[PDB]
Each structure stands twice: as C-alpha cells, then as structure tokens.
Design a binder for this molecule. Sequence first.
Ligand code: 4BW
Ligand code: 4BW
Ligand code: 4BW
Ligand code: 4BW
Lengths: 344, 344, 344, 344
Amino acid sequence: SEIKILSLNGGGVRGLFTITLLAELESIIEKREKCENVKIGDYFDLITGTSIGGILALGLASGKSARELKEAFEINATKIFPLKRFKNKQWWNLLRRSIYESEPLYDAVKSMIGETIKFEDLNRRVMITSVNLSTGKPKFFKTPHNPMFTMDREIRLIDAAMATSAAPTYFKPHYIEKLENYFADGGLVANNPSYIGIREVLIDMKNDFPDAKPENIKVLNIGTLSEDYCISPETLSKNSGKGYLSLWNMGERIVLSTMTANQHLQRFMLLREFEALKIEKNYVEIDETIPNEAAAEITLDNASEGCLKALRGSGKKLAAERYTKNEELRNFFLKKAEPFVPYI
Amino acid sequence: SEIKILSLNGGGVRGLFTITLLAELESIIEKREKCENVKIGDYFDLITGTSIGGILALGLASGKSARELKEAFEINATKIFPLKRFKNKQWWNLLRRSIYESEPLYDAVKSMIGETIKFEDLNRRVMITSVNLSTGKPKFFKTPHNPMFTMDREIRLIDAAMATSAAPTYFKPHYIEKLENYFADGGLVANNPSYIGIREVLIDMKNDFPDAKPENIKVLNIGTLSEDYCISPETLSKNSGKGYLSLWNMGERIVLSTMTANQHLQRFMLLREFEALKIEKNYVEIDETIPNEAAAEITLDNASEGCLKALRGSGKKLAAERYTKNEELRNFFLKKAEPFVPYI
Amino acid sequence: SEIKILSLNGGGVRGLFTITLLAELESIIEKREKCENVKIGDYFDLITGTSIGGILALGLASGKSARELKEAFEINATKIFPLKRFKNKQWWNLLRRSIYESEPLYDAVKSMIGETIKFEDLNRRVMITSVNLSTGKPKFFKTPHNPMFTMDREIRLIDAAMATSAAPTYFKPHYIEKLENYFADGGLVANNPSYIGIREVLIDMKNDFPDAKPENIKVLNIGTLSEDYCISPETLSKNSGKGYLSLWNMGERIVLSTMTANQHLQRFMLLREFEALKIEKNYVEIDETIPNEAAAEITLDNASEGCLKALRGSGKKLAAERYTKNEELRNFFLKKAEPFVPYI
Amino acid sequence: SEIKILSLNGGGVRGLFTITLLAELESIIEKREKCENVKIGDYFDLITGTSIGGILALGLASGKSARELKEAFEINATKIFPLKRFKNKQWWNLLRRSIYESEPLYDAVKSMIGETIKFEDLNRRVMITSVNLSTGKPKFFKTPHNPMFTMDREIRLIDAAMATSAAPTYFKPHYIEKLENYFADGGLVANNPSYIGIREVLIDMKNDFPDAKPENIKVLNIGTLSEDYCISPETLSKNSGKGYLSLWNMGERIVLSTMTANQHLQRFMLLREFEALKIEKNYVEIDETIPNEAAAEITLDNASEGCLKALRGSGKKLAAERYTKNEELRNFFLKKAEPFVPYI
Ligand SMILES: Nc1nc2c(ncn2[C@@H]2O[C@@H]3COP(=O)(O)O[C@H]4[C@@H](O)[C@H](n5cnc6c(N)ncnc65)O[C@@H]4COP(=O)(O)O[C@H]3[C@H]2O)c(=O)[nH]1
Ligand SMILES: Nc1nc2c(ncn2[C@@H]2O[C@@H]3COP(=O)(O)O[C@H]4[C@@H](O)[C@H](n5cnc6c(N)ncnc65)O[C@@H]4COP(=O)(O)O[C@H]3[C@H]2O)c(=O)[nH]1
Ligand SMILES: Nc1nc2c(ncn2[C@@H]2O[C@@H]3COP(=O)(O)O[C@H]4[C@@H](O)[C@H](n5cnc6c(N)ncnc65)O[C@@H]4COP(=O)(O)O[C@H]3[C@H]2O)c(=O)[nH]1
Ligand SMILES: Nc1nc2c(ncn2[C@@H]2O[C@@H]3COP(=O)(O)O[C@H]4[C@@H](O)[C@H](n5cnc6c(N)ncnc65)O[C@@H]4COP(=O)(O)O[C@H]3[C@H]2O)c(=O)[nH]1
C-alpha cells in the first residue's frame, strides 16, 4: 500500500513559488508521460495547507489545475497587496488599523475556488489549519473523511480559505457567519502542516486506510522559501538587559521567535520520527533558503514585478532540478490517487 | 512492562500548586504504605518540565523530595517576585527594561538543586524545554539516556533551569557560557511537555526500553491551574477592524493566542493519539481551572500571602481527591522506577 | 427499557446557548437521518427546566421545535433586557426597585409558548421548578403524569414560565392569580434540575414506568455556561475579619455562595449516586466553562450583539463536537419518546 | 439487618433543645433499662450534624455522653453569645464587622471535645457538613468509613466543629491551617443533614454494610425547633414592585428564603422516597414548632436564661412524650451499634 500527502506552507506572496513549482511539475508530467489535462491534485490522498498554502490546497482539492491557479495568483498578487498600502506601513498606521484590505483577498480567492462550493462537495481530502480567536483553540477545517464529522460539511471553502489567511497584523480577523466565531491565520499553530498531515491519516482517515502506518506514508512538502528567524547577535549581546522597545521591539521578536521555533519544532518531530523508523526518504521536502540580499527584497507581502519574477524563476528551477535528482519525487506522480467519496 | 512519565507545566508562581500537589502526594504514600523517606521522583522513568515546571523537574531528578522543594519555594517565592517590582508594571517600565531580576531567581534555584550538579551526574532522566534565541530553534536539555548524546553532559543544571524559566518579558534571556547562546522560556514551544515526553521514550530512550510503544506508556501530567486564554467577544465584535492598539493591544494578544493555541494543539495530538488506540486512561491529567474572581488574583507572578495560600490549598485538595478516585494515579506509585545509569 | 430525561439550567441570556445547542442538534439529526420537521422535544420522556431553562422546557413540551424557540429568543433577547436598563444598574435603582420589567418578558414568553395552553393539554411530561414565597416551600409545576395529581391541571403554562424566571433582584416576584401566591426564581432551590428529574421518574411517574431504576434512566443535562463561583482569595485573606460591606458585600456573596454550593451539591449527589452503580455514562452533561475575559462580558443579563454572537457560536460548536465524540449523546435520538397521555 | 442514623440540625442556642432532648433520653434509658453509663452514641452506626448540630455530633462521636455535653453547653452558652453582644446588633456594627467572636466559641468547643482528637482516632462514624468558601463547593468532614479516601484523617475535630458553625453573618469564616481554605456554616448547604445521611450509608459505607438498602435504614432526626420562613403577605402584596430596601431587605429575605426552601426541598425528597418504598415509619423526626409569641423571643442567638429554660423544658417534655407514644423511637435504643474500626 501507499498513502501520499501534499503539504503546503504559508508564505503570503511566497506562495507564488509554491504554485509555480506545482505548475512547472504539472507541465513536466505532461511532456514526459505524453499526457494531457494533468491535475496535480489527483496524485495525493490528502492535501494540507496553511495561510496562502491553504488557499492553494483548497483550489487543488476543488479540481483546478496548478497552472490555472498559477495564473489567478499573478493577476491578483498586485491586488491583494496594493503598492500604496505596502509602502505605507509606519507605526501610526500599524497601531490604528490592519494593513491592506480583506475585500481584494476575497475577490482573489473567489476567482480561484468559487463562492458557493462547500466541504461536502469536494472529491479530494483536504485540511486547512486555523486559529479560533473567540475560543483560543485551533480549528481545523477538513472534508468529512471521518464519517462522524459533522461540523463543517456545509461550510463554504471561501470562508475557510479567508480564515486561514487572516494574518494577525496583515489582515483583519475573518468572521464566519455559519460559526459566529472570528478566526486568525493558521500559521499561528502549524505553519508547516507536514507533521499534522501524517497524524490525520493515522487517526481520522481510518475508514479508507484501516492499516495505516507511518512507514506507508509519503509526504511531499513544498515550502515558501522559509527564512530561519533568529535574533541578531549584536542585538542580543548589547540589549539583552533592555525591555520591549530595544529587545523584543514591540511584539515583533516575541511572535516571530514563537512561530519560527514552533515551526522548527513540528519539523523536528517529523524528522525524528522518520529517523527512528529508518524511513527518512518518505519525507520529501522541496525548499530553498533565500539569500541575504534577496531576503530584503522578497518579503511576506511584496508584489513588485521584480520580486514576482524571482519567485516564479525559483519555482521553475527547483521543479526541474528536484525531478531530475529526487527519485522519490518522481514516484509521487506514478499513479493517480483514488477519489475521495464521502461516506453517509 | 510499564514506562511512567511525569510532566510539569510552566506557570511561574503558580508552580507552587504543582509542587504542593506532589508534596501532598508524597505524604499520602508515606502514611498509607507505612514507609519513610519517600521521594516522588523514584517512581518515574522520565521527568519533563518547562519554566517553573522545569526547575521542579530538575529538583526531583537530582534526588530532592517534593516536600524539600516545596519548602524552598515558599521562602523564595517573595524574593523571586518582589512586591516592589510586581506593582510597578507600568508601560514606561516595561518599555525600558524587563521587570523583575534574574539574581533572586538564580539564588532560589541554587538552593533548590545546587550549583555544581551536571546532567551526567543525574540518576534520573529529565527534559528541560527551552528556546535558543541565537539560532531560533528549540533547545532541549536532557540527560544522556541516548549514549550518543554529548552536548549537555557537562552543562550545570542551574544553567538549564534558568534557561527554561527566562520568560520573554518577565526575565532577561539567559546566557549560557558553555554554549555561547542566549535562551528564553521553554513555554514558547511546549508549555505542556506531556506530548514531547512520550515522543522521547519511543525515539531516544531506546537503549533502556527497546520495545517501547504508546500502549506501555503512562503519563502523569500535573497542571499549573491553566487558564484558557481567548479574545473578549466584545473586543472581537467591536475592534476587529482596528489593529495593534484596540485589537492586539500591543503584542500581548498575539503572543497569548499563539502559545495557548500551540499548547492546546500539543494536548490535542496527545488526546487524539491515545483515543486512537483506546488507551486514553494512560494519560492522567491533574489540573483545574481558576474561578473568574480568583483568576484575577492568581496571576503568573503574584506572590501575595493570600494568593500563596490558595495555590497551596488547591494542591492539597486535588491530591487527596484524585488519589481516592483515580485508580490510575495510585498505580503510578506501586513500584519504584529503576535508576538510570548513563552508558559509556 | 430506557427512560430519557432532558434537563436545562437557568442562565438568563445564557439560555440562548442552551437553545442554540438544541437547535443545531435538530439540524444534525435532520441532515444525517434525512428526516424532516424534527423536534428535539419528541425524544425525551421527561423535560425539566429552571429559570430561562424552564421557559425553553415548556416550549419544547408543547411541541414547538428548538429552532423556532431559538428565533423567538433572539428577537426578544434585547426586549427582555433593554440596554438602557442594563446600563442603569446603579445603587439607587437597585435599592429602590427591581431591575428590568416583567411585561417584556411576559410578551416574549407569550410569543414563545402562547397564553392559553394549560398543563392538562400537554402531550409531553414537563416539570418546572419555582419557590413559593408566600409559604416558603419550593413549588414545582408539572404535567399530571401522576393520576392523583390535581393542582396544576387547569393553570396556564405562561404562569409557570413567568414564575420560574422571577429572579429575586432581576425581576419582581410573579403573582399567580389562580393560586393567590407569589413566586420567585426556580434557581433558588435547583439551578441544575438533573437530580430532581431522576427522582420524579422513580416516584411520580410510576404508572407509565412501573419498573424504573436509575440504570435505565439517561439524563441529557444541557448547561447554561455554568461558572464556578467562589470568594476571591485576596478578599478572604484580607477581609475575613470584617462584616457585610467588605466581606459578603451586602447579600451578594451569601446568596451566590448558597446557590453555587446548593447547585454543586445536587450535581454531587447525582455523580455519587451514578458512580456507585457504575452507570456514570448515563449522565450526559454538555457544558463548558467561560474563559475569564469572556466571562466578564457574558453576564446573566447582557444582551449586547457581541455577547449574543458568542453564546450562539458556543452552542453551534459544542453540539457538533459532542455529537461526533459522545456516543451516548447520539443514542438519545435513536428513537422518539412515546407521547404522554394524561390518565383520567 | 438494621442501620441507625442520628441527624442533628443547626439552630445556634436552639441546639440546647437538641442536646436536652438527647440528654433526657439517656435518663429514661437508664431508669427503664436499669443500666449505668449509657451513651446514645453507641446506638447509632452514623452520626450526622450541621452547625451546632455538628458540634454535638462530634461530641457524641468522640464517646462523651449527652448529659456531659448538656452541662458544658449550658455554662458556655452565655459566653458564646455574650449579653454585651446581641444587644448592640445595630446596622452599622453589622455593616462593619461580624457580630460575636470566634474565640469564646473556640474555647467552648475545646471543653466539649478537646484539641488533639482527630477523625482517624474516632471509633464512631461521623459526617459534618460545611461549605468551602475558597472553592465554592460544599466540603464534608467525615471519618474514614470508606478506607479509600485520606483527607480528613489528620484534621482535628475542633477544626471541623469551628468550620461547620461559622455562620456567614454571626461569625467570621473559619480558616483551617491544614487545608489553607476558609469555611462557612454548613446550614447553607444542608441545614437538615437527614437526607444526605441516608446517601452516605448507601454510597460511602459499602464496606461494613455491602447489602444496604433504604428499607433497612432508620433515621432519628432531632430538630432544633425549626421555624418555617415565609415573606409576610402584607409585605409581599404592598412591596412586590419594590427593590431591596423594601422587598428583600438587604440580603436577609433572599438568604433566608433560599436557606429554608433548600432545607424544605431536602426533607421533601426524604419523605417522597420513603413513601415510594412505603417505609415512612423509618424516618423518625422529633421536632415541634415554636409558638409565635416565644418565636420572637427564642432566636438562634438568644442566650437569655429564660430562653434556655424554655429550650430545656421543651427538650425534657418532648423526650418523655415521644418515648411513650413513638414505638419506633424506642426501637432505636434496643441494641448498641457496633464500634467503627477504620480499615487500613
Ligand atoms: N475539524 C473538525 N472537527 C470536527 C468535525 N466534525 C466534528 N468535529 C469534532 O470537533 C472537534 C474539534 O475540532 P477542531 O478542529 O476545532 O479541533 C481540533 C484541532 O484543533 C486539532 N486537530 C484535529 N486534527 C488534527 C491533526 N490531524 N493534527 C493536529 N491537530 C489536529 O485537535 C482538535 C480536536 O480534534 P478532535 O478530532 O479530537 O475533535 C474534533 C472532532 O471530534 C469536522 O468536520 N471538522
Ligand atoms: N538535546 C540534545 N541533543 C543532543 C545532545 N547530544 C547531541 N545532540 C544532538 O543535537 C541535536 C539538536 O539538539 P536540540 O535539542 O537543540 O534540538 C532538538 C529539539 O529542538 C527537538 N526535540 C528533541 N527531542 C524532542 C522530543 N522528544 N520532542 C520534541 N522535540 C524534540 O528536536 C531537535 C532535534 O533533535 P535530534 O535528536 O534530531 O537532534 C539533536 C541530537 O542529535 C544532547 O545531550 N542533548
Ligand atoms: N407539584 C404538584 N404537586 C401536586 C399536584 N397535585 C397534587 N400535588 C401535591 O401537592 C404537594 C405539594 O406540591 P409542591 O410541588 O408545591 O411540593 C413539592 C416540591 O416542593 C417537592 N418535589 C416534588 N417532586 C419533586 C421531585 N421530583 N424532586 C424534588 N423535589 C420534588 O416536594 C414537595 C412535596 O412533594 P409531593 O409531590 O409529594 O407533594 C405534592 C403533591 O402531593 C400537582 O399537579 N403538582
Ligand atoms: N468528604 C470527604 N471526601 C474525601 C475525603 N478524602 C478524600 N475525599 C474525596 O474528595 C472528594 C470531594 O470531597 P468533599 O467532601 O469536599 O466534596 C463532597 C461533598 O460536597 C458532597 N458529598 C459527599 N458525600 C455526600 C453525601 N453523603 N451526601 C451528600 N453530599 C455528599 O459531594 C462531594 C463529592 O464527594 P465524592 O465522595 O464524590 O468525592 C470526594 C472524595 O472522593 C474525606 O475525608 N472526606
């Protein structure tokens, strides 16, 4: 047996790299296998996403090809993140209102996945991570692969996508009318949903895969040019005895360390678990650390055509290179995954 | 076979409840079993801790009884959190320097565990969760239960204890001279180390327990009167359109939502995993929620005499009741755990 | 055989959570079982209520669906607790006259249950708790499931609902013309009618169920977001030597402690009784403690839009979660309860 | 087999009537049976008390005769309620500090039972009711008749007696050092512990009495001249629309109505349950209503020698009258109850 999981991280604009890599991968399969109408979502038994990766995960699960999702991203990339609002991010605007607007994101997501499709209408298993601000617990939107799951069978995908992409300071929290709860970005809990995806197969998807073990689970994780955050040695050495304004400038250093360490933590337990089982090859991670000079330019919410070119170029480059070398990456697209038929 | 794990959460001054419950548990075993000189750390194969729970974890691992640690806690509680610094938590002080000081905490830990004991001298396995601010990854101090471990064999316990208790704003980051790195509180990654404790037995603790499975693992997670943080519904309804002043009042609401959701998540994977194999009884959690009026009084760093009595009273109360009803709690102290000898 | 009991607590506006949970339960049964025109009151052989839970109990007993009562409550919630009077809860008003008015509550119940239905017309057994102020003994309004019971046969249902909701300080005592006696809130003797509901089946309902024992009795107690009241440790430590103004500020602390202790006691007798017979699973209690920040806003009489959203959101979320996990909750709706025919 | 339970209510100085009735009954047994040194505590398998009834319950459980306690109560009654107090019970005094003092009560109780006696040393089963002000839940002090619990074995009886007699407005809350919790009068929870005594036998005392049913249980409840409380019809009719100052004059009319209705409710379940099994003769209640003219004179804190004579006279005449008529009363003292041996 074999279970394939596709995991997308959250990277805001950097999700363009995630979708460009998948779009380039789709073209390679079409050319090499002499196939047509190749959808990258047909090769995975479960698709997990977070933040901008959640929106792409819902689109792939809905039935749209990565190439179609790729085109909608570039057109709406400059609309989700307007240049005027991107330039104006001073402290007075930061402490008065949330940066950017939610309507352009709503219109962008509406174009890709739609506005009326619900989780019970999906033929592909999905999981979208989110944080329930009203309660404080993390809420995970997912298709009813568990027959007893009746909480979000009638929740529109556009609500889950908009909830998981509501960055605490980059967008206002998303209000879901069907649940009467406000939600925040899913990156506050699992910015890398690779680990929790394996947990779902061994816990929730026990009806389609009764004899499921981590040995028979292959994870294809597509990063968003992850940047390992850390406090500058000069800042730590000289300002460790200061508070807030100098060290932990406002909430910035405390939150960024919290997400980065938590993201590192969940990545570690995945690596440790596969190491102990001698199945480290099952976790196929496709990511590339962005250089220092490009880091100052390619930010979380930079939609300039110069930065858009670099992300598209990196996605095409990694897709071609990793397909040539990583044999396990090629084994992912050897056979189409069975469609998810909900059990009633 | 049986493997027993003790997990202690981090809550600053509320750790008095954690140690009072263990101290009360020690006296109960002495009276009912008619034995003398009973140490609560002799019944566990691994002790995990975080923040104040980490400091108590090192005390039990070293060989000091919970009653001795409890006595040192009350005397040092006022010194760790002086009333002069506690009342002066205004913004013009928090924006300039971190409140409280590390020296009073250093002496409290020194009288608790010692000053020259190193991880290679311990006869009991232990975790200490921490965040490496210099690198951004979480750093876990632990005894060499894995024979290939050479990083903390020559690290003093007092350095690990001060690293895990270095709250981002309540204390300055702890600088370990032997590692040349600055460390922060371990509650940023795992306020409840119960889940990561189970992972240790199946991953690194294989030299002593080769056939280790979650079925043969019993966890005694002692709470710290955990408070389920959430955004006020009036605030969310009225201030969702604002940013960083009304909603997310400075960084406070972002961090608390992040840690609580992460702490909720790790407990959720913990509960979901045990429920999968129908061994939910293996996880024993001893914790209760603080009433609304008391929660306003019992804060993270309140060392008032009235608050100390409530924490001590709650620990004595819960220990007696849970021992009577929870048979699984009584099964922990049926046999002493074998001493851990490092492999050379 | 099997006897099913529904018990509802009194929480003022928090009863919206009680009816929202019941309303969403009705939709789940309709969606999963493909049924139509489902009523949550047709699956219970006895319905017990108190205060705002008594009004909902009377509505379900007559034959109204939980969804209709939910819609009626939302429209009238603002009317019952006007913002002008809610904000004007100062000391001169409280010392001169009762807060709020009875006529808006009278109209709300009138549009919810009617104004002419009497206890002899009901086809479902119900019991409503109240306090007879004229005599001092607790008076219980109930349908004549006992053939010898002729006291409430010819009394309107709205009078019982009006009587049980007459909070001592939030409403004026309700005067029943047919009985010539004044009545107060039913929460003074039983805020949780779960225990007294079991006694009724074994004492009064002996004709329909001759061989009735607690093993065949299942109770579905729907909470009202109960809060565990206690005196703050700072108040107890510093003001135990004072009187009234400081400790027991007027009658507030005495009445709250007496009501909370009595409510805790009756629940304790239920848990002790069931655990002695190894039938603890028969008591299905669906309740959740409010977080400290939310508990400040969500009070007994706050009808603001933000608070109403949270109560509705919690009910929707709780109903979905417990239905998936708790198998005993699902077993309640496996078969409709037999209609109650008053024997003559 | 038969199980005999003695239950004593709480009425302050009215407990002198309870002890006088108990002391007189000893004299009749001595005269009729021609025996020497008869203690009524040896004829009961469980003794339950509340407030002043709890203090007498502990004295009987220790092994002291009722006559000895009657002599001690007579001299100490004036000191417990000094005539300097009870005459200056002005509103400002009550608005500032609690009336009376605990030290005269503490010294009085010490002469009754002692100071070093503990529950584990008792040879008779006892159960004392109290409410934990720190937690809000009722706390019941009892001997270890069920060996599986260990909380009160090392608590002095004088602490339980002080806790259960701590009237919220007549005495300051009692602080127990061994538990770090404040306590109040048990009359708030159960002023008549007759009902909870039956549940204690059928739940906790399953070791000595495994096959225990309510049929084989006889209860001898000795009241303290209980007076039913009801709001005056003139006040109710005229001040129904008023608040506090007129209707519910401060907390008085709310606490009293809540207290008397809860006491009525608990007695009602005892009556209703016994009628169901047709064992109404088992509940032998010895109490009479105080005439109206002396009702205003004989209060719960009146230490005048005239009221003491009336209480002594009522107890002396009730014991003689009931013994001749009530055959079931005589059957209580037919055989001595087996001593309580705490199983270890
Ligand atoms: N997400 C979800 N939950 C549902 C659904 N129908 C019923 N439920 C129930 O609601 C509970 C809470 O859902 P949540 O997503 O808000 O919280 C979740 C989420 O925060 C987390 N979680 C779920 N799956 C996870 C996973 N695979 N990895 C890591 N964390 C996970 O654990 C919580 C408890 O999961 P659970 O399966 O024991 O309980 C569910 C589950 O029993 C449904 O359609 N979706
Ligand atoms: N903690 C530790 N690590 C040691 C020691 N000697 C060598 N090492 C090595 O250093 C690596 C990083 O240590 P860390 O504790 O800073 O990061 C750790 C810690 O952040 C996390 N981790 C470790 N055990 C964990 C656990 N049980 N649960 C959750 N996370 C855990 O994963 C990281 C990688 O663990 P690993 O065992 O694969 O690699 C170790 C391990 O191979 C040693 O004495 N202690
Ligand atoms: N409630 C009620 N009582 C009736 C009716 N017709 C005749 N009665 C009689 O009037 C008595 C006083 O009614 P109450 O409800 O005001 O007091 C009740 C009520 O305060 C309480 N009670 C009744 N059922 C209870 C129950 N199931 N659980 C707890 N307490 C209960 O005990 C009191 C006396 O019990 P009871 O039912 O034997 O006495 C009834 C009963 O014998 C009638 O239609 N309703
Ligand atoms: N009463 C008591 N309980 C003890 C002791 N040692 C351990 N415990 C445990 O602590 C729990 C709570 O004690 P509490 O007396 O403060 O609350 C008690 C008390 O408030 C109430 N209660 C106990 N016995 C009762 C009874 N017979 N009738 C009515 N209410 C009763 O119910 C609560 C829960 O009782 P429980 O037996 O299930 O759990 C006990 C019991 O398991 C002990 O010495 N006494």
